[PDB]
C-alpha cells in the first residue's frame, strides 16, 4: 500500500507546495513522483533511491526510508503546477501508485478590477453569455443552484507576453429570468464588481 | 516512446474492443491500468516478456496479448457500462526502474448510440465596456449538447493554433446533472490586446474536436450520424 | 385520408425465388423536411408487426440484407432477393408523412413446398370431461402442404354432420406446413351408446383416405 | 432489454369505455413517442394517434376525435389509450408501438417496439372462464382441450416455456352456444412418456384463469 495526503491543497503562487507519500513494504527500493494534468496521462518527474534530498529545478523530493517516507515540494509554486502528483513505489526492476494529490496554485493577484461584462454570440445577438473576470484568487465561484443555469469555474488566464494573469468564470441560461447582474448572485462576489 | 491508439472511443455495451500500445524502447515489461476518479490507477493485466502475460488486479471482461515485445493490446471482450474509463497503457525496462505512460484512452460504453451528440460551439465577442476599462478583450467558446465527453477544444489566430492568454474549463458541465447520460458543456476563453481585437484583419476561431461514431456504423434517426468531426464557430476583428 | 394500396394481396413464391410487393399512395409522400416517410412492416402469424424498410429504402438494423426498398413519388416496391421459409407473413406499407398515418391492405406472403401428407391422431374424451356431461373427440392432422384437406368422422360407422368444429394453424416459419385440429362434440349419453369411434382424413398426400379410431363408450 | 408490456384482454359491453395501459421497460421513457395502432380480426392495421410523453403533445386520426384519450404516467412509465362509446366495429387487438426518434427526432413517424397487443371484445355477453382437460397420448402426440370460454384469448404454453419445438396452438372455433373452444398439441419422442413430464399452461387474462394442467400417457 501507498498512501497520500488527503484533499486538494490550495497554495498561493511564490508558496511551496508540500507533498507526502508513506509506503507500507519496508523492502522498498525505488520511489517515484509522477505528475498528472486534468485529462492529460501521468509524466515521471522525480525518481530517488537513498536517504537525503533530491533537487531538480523547483522539485525537492526527500526520502526516509526508515520512517517509510517520501515528500515532494514545488518551491516558487506557479498556477503551472496545477495538477494532480502521484507517488509510487517498487521494489526491484509491481509499481504500487497512490491514490494522488491534487494541487491547486492559486494566482498572484495584484491589481484587481473584478466586472461582470456581457458578451454575444459572433453569429446572434439574442445569445450571450456572463463573464464575471478580473477578480483576485480570494474569491470562490459557486456552482449553479438552478437547473437552466450554467456556471463554470474560475479558470486562469496567462498573457505570457506581458506577465499578465487574470482569473474568470462564465455564465449562461436561456431562461428569460437570467441578466448578468443576477448570474453570479451564488457567490460572495466583492462589494466593488464593476457591472455596466 | 510509448503510443495507444485509439485515444478517444464511445462503445455500444456488448461490443468488443482492442486498444493498442506499442512502445519503441526494447522495453521488456508492458502493463495495462484503468484510471477511475474514486480509486486511481488500477492494474487490469501486465507483461513480464514476449510471450509472457499475467493478471493484474482487475482482469475481469479484458484479455492482454503479448507476440512481439513492441505490441501489447488490450482486448475488451463484451463491453459493459463499467468499463467507461480512461485506460494506460506503460512500459518499463524490465531488466533502470522507471515507468513511462503512454497518451491514454478515453472510453464510454452507452446503452445505446442514440445518447451520442455532437457539440454545438458558438464564440462570443468582447464585451465594450471590457475594452475600454481594461484595454483587453476577451473571447469566449462554449462546447454545448455533446455526448460523450470526448472533445478537443483549440483556439486559433489568424490560422495557427494559439496557447497564450487561454483557459478552457478542466472538467466540463452536466447540463443534466441527476442524469447518466447528461449531454455536457465546456466553456473557453482567449483575451487579447484591445489594440489587437480592434484590427478587422485578424480572425479568430474556436475549433471542438468530437469524436463519435464511425461512417460504418448504422443509424436510424433523421438527424445527421453523430460521426468524429470537427465542429467550429468564428469571429472576425472589428474597429468599433 | 392518403390511400395506401398493395399489389398483389397474396403472393406465393418458392424458397429461392425473388418476390415484389408494390404499394402505390393517392398522394406524394416527401415530407416539408425532405424526407419521406414510407415504411415496411411484416407481422408473422399471432406477433406484433415487424419493421423492415423504413423512409423508402433504408433497411432497419437485424433485418436481412435480402430485403430491400425503392420507389419515389407515388409507387414504391419491396424486394426479397432470395425468399426464405421464415419470410412467411403478411407485409403492409405504411405512410407517416401525412396524418392521419396510413397502412396499406396487406400482402401475404404464402411460400410454396412440396406436398407432405398429414400425420394423423386421434384422442377420446378425458374422463374428468366425461364427467361433466359432455364428450369431445379430437382429430390432429400435423405438418402437411397443401392446406386443402377434408376430415370425416363416424360413429359406429355412421358418417357425422353438424356435430364437429375444425381450425387449421397459419403456414409454418421453419417447414411451411399447416396443421389442422378437428373436435367432434357429442353429449356423455351419447357417447356412451357407441363404440367406434373414427374420423377419416383425405389430403393430396394420401394416395388413399387414412382412418384413425379407437373403440369404447 | 426494451419491453412494452400492455394490459391484458377486456370484454366491455356497446356504449362502455376501455383504457388498454401499456408500461415501458429498458429505455428512458419520456425520450421517445408513443403510438397506438389498431388490427381487427383478420384485417389490417389503423394508426389511431400518439402521445410525446416528454410534453404531453398528442396527434389524432379524425375517426376517434371524440372518442380516444391518450395520457401518460411519467412515474411508472406507463402510457394510456382510453376510447369511450365503444361499438361492435371497436372489437380489435390494440397495441402500443414506440417512435424510433429519441429526444425530439423525426425518427418517431416509424415505429421499433411494439407490444403485445390488448385484445378488446365488445359484446353484451358474459365473462367464462374455460375448463382444460388432457388429450393424453417413433413419435406421441399429446395435447390440452380449453374448452368453454368467453371472449377472446387464451395463452396456453408447455413447461412454462421450456417446450416449443412441435408446439401447435389452433386458432379457437366459436361453438353454437357462443362461447370459444381451441386446442393445444404438442409431438413428442414416443420414447419419453414415461421419463419427462408434461404440463400445460393456460391464461385466460378476462376472467383471471391460470390453470397448469398435467398430462399424463392412459
Ligand atoms: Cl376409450
Ligand atoms: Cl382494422
Ligand atoms: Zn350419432
Ligand atoms: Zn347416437
Ligand atoms: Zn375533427
Known amino acids: 500500500e501507498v498512501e497520500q495526503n488527503s484533499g486538494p491543497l490550495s497554495v498561493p503562487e511564490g508558496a511551496i507546495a508540500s507533498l507526502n507519500c508513506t509506503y507500507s513494504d519496508r523492502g522498498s527500493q525505488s520511489f517515484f513522483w509522477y505528475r498528472q494534468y486534468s485529462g492529460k496521462s501521468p509524466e515521471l518527474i522525480m525518481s530517488?533511491?537513498?536517504?537525503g534530498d533530491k533537487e531538480d529545478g523547483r522539485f525537492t523530493a526527500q526520502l526516509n526510508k526508515a520512517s517509510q517516507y517520501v515528500s515532494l515540494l514545488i518551491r516558487d509554486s506557479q498556477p503551472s503546477d496545477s495538477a494532480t502528483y502521484l507517488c509510487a513505489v517498487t521494489t526491484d526492476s509491481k509499481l504500487q501508485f497512490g491514490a494522488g494529490t491534487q494541487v491547486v496554485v492559486t494566482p498572484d493577484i495584484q491589481n484587481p478590477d473584478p466586472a461582470v461584462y456581457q458578451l454575444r454570440d459572433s453569429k446572434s445577438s439574442d445569445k450571450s453569455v456572463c463573464l464575471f473576470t478580473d477578480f483576485d484568487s480570494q474569491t470562490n465561484v459557486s456552482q449553479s443552484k438552478d437547473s437552466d443555469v450554467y456556471i463554470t469555474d474560475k479558470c486562469v488566464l496567462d498573457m505570457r507576453s506581458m506577465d499578465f494573469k487574470s482569473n474568470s468564470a462564465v455564465a449562461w441560461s436561456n431562461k428569460s429570468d437570467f441578466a448578468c447582474a443576477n448570474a453570479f448572485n451564488n457567490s460572495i462576489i466583492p462589494e466593488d464588481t464593476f457591472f455596466p | 516512446g510509448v503510443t495507444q491508439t485509439p485515444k478517444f472511443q464511445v462503445l455500444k455495451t456488448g461490443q468488443s474492443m482492442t486498444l493498442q500500445c506499442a512502445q519503441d524502447?526494447?522495453?521488456?515489461?508492458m502493463s495495462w491500468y484503468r484510471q477511475d476518479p474514486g480509486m486511481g490507477l488500477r492494474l487490469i493485466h501486465y507483461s513480464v516478456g514476449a510471450g509472457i502475460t499475467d493478471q493484474g488486479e482487475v482482469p475481469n471482461g479484458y484479455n492482454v496479448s503479448r507476440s512481439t515485445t513492441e505490441d501489447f493490446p488490450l482486448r475488451l471482450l463484451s463491453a459493459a457500462p463499467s468499463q467507461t474509463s480512461v485506460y494506460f497503457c506503460?512500459?518499463?525496462?524490465?531488466?533502470?526502474?522507471?515507468?513511462?505512460f503512454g497518451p491514454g484512452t478515453r472510453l464510454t460504453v452507452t446503452e445505446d448510440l442514440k445518447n451520442v451528440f455532437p457539440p454545438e460551439v458558438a464564440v462570443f465577442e468582447p464585451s465594450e465596456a471590457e475594452i475600454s476599462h481594461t484595454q483587453k478583450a476577451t473571447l469566449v467558446c462554449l462546447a454545448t449538447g455533446f455526448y460523450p465527453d470526448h472533445v478537443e477544444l483549440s483556439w486559433w489566430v489568424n490560422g495557427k493554433e494559439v496557447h497564450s492568454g487561454v483557459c478552457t474549463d478542466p472538467q466540463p458541465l452536466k447540463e443534466q446533472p441527476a442524469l447518466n447520460d447528461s449531454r455536457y458543456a465546456l466553456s473557453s476563453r482567449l483575451r487579447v490586446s484591445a489594440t489587437f481585437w480592434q484590427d478587422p484583419r485578424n480572425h479568430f476561431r474556436c475549433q471542438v474536436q468530437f469524436y463519435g461514431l464511425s461512417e460504418n456504423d448504422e443509424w436510424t434517426q433523421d438527424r445527421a450520424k453523430p460521426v468524429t468531426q470537427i465542429v467550429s464557430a468564428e469571429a472576425w476583428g472589428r474597429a468599433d | 385520408d392518403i390511400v395506401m394500396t398493395q399489389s398483389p394481396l397474396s403472393l406465393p413464391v418458392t424458397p429461392g425465388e425473388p418476390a415484389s410487393i408494390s404499394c402505390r399512395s393517392s398522394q406524394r409522400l416527401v415530407h416539408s423536411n425532405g424526407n419521406t416517410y414510407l415504411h415496411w412492416y411484416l407481422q408473422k402469424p399471432g406477433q406484433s408487426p415487424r419493421l423492415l424498410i423504413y423512409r423508402v429504402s433504408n433497411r432497419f438494423p437485424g433485418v436481412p440484407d435480402r430485403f430491400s426498398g425503392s420507389g419515389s413519388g407515388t409507387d414504391f416496391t419491396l424486394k426479397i432477393s432470395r425468399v426464405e421459409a421464415e419470410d412467411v407473413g403478411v407485409y403492409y406499407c405504411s405512410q407517416s408523412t401525412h396524418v392521419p398515418y396510413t397502412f396499406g391492405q396487406g400482402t401475404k406472403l404464402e411460400i410454396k413446398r412440396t406436398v407432405a401428407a398429414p400425420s394423423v391422431f386421434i384422442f377420446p374424451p378425458s374422463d374428468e370431461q366425461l364427467k361433466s356431461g359432455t364428450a369431445s373427440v379430437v382429430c390432429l392432422l400435423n405438418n402437411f402442404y397443401p392446406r386443402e384437406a377434408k376430415v370425416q368422422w363416424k360413429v359406429d360407422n355412421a358418417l357425422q354432420s353438424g356435430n364437429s368444429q375444425e381450425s387449421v394453424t397459419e403456414q409454418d416459419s421453419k417447414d411451411s406446413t399447416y396443421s389442422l385440429s378437428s373436435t367432434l362434440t357429442l353429449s356423455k349419453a351419447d357417447y356412451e351408446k357407441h363404440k367406434v369411434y373414427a374420423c377419416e382424413v383425405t389430403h393430396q398426400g394420401l394416395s388413399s383416405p387414412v382412418t384413425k379410431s379407437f373403440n369404447r363408450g | 432489454q426494451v419491453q412494452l408490456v400492455q394490459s391484458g384482454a377486456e370484454v366491455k359491453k356497446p356504449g362502455a369505455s376501455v383504457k388498454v395501459s401499456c408500461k415501458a421497460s429498458g429505455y428512458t421513457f419520456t425520450g421517445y413517442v408513443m403510438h397506438w395502432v389498431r388490427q381487427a380480426p383478420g384485417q389490417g392495421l389503423e394508426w389511431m394517434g400518439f402521445i410525446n410523453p416528454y410534453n404531453d403533445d398528442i396527434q389524432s386520426n379524425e375517426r376517434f376525435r371524440g372518442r380516444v384519450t391518450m395520457t401518460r404516467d411519467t412515474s411508472i412509465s406507463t402510457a394510456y389509450m382510453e376510447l369511450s362509446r365503444l361499438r361492435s366495429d371497436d372489437t380489435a387487438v390494440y397495441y402500443c408501438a414506440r417512435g424510433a426518434g429519441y429526444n425530439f427526432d423525426g425518427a418517431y413517424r416509424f415505429f421499433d417496439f411494439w407490444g403485445q397487443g390488448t385484445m378488446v371484445t365488445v359484446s353484451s355477453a358474459s365473462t367464462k372462464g374455460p375448463s382444460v382437460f388432457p388429450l393424453a397420448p417413433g413419435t406421441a402426440a399429446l395435447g390440452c382441450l380449453v374448452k368453454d370460454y368467453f371472449p377472446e384469448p387464451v395463452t396456453v404454453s408447455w413447461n412454462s416455456g421450456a417446450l416449443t419445438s412441435g408446439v401447435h396452438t389452433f386458432p379457437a372455433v366459436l361453438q353454437s352456444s357462443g362461447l370459444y373452444s381451441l386446442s393445444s398439441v404438442v409431438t413428442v419422442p414416443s420414447s419419453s412418456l414415461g421419463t419427462q413430464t408434461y404440463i400445460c399452461n393456460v391464461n385466460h387474462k378476462p376472467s383471471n384463469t391460470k390453470v397448469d394442467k398435467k398430462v399424463e400417457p392412459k
Open positions: 506503460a512500459s518499463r525496462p524490465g531488466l533502470r526502474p522507471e515507468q513511462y
Open positions: 530517488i533511491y537513498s536517504n
Open positions: 524502447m526494447n522495453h521488456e515489461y
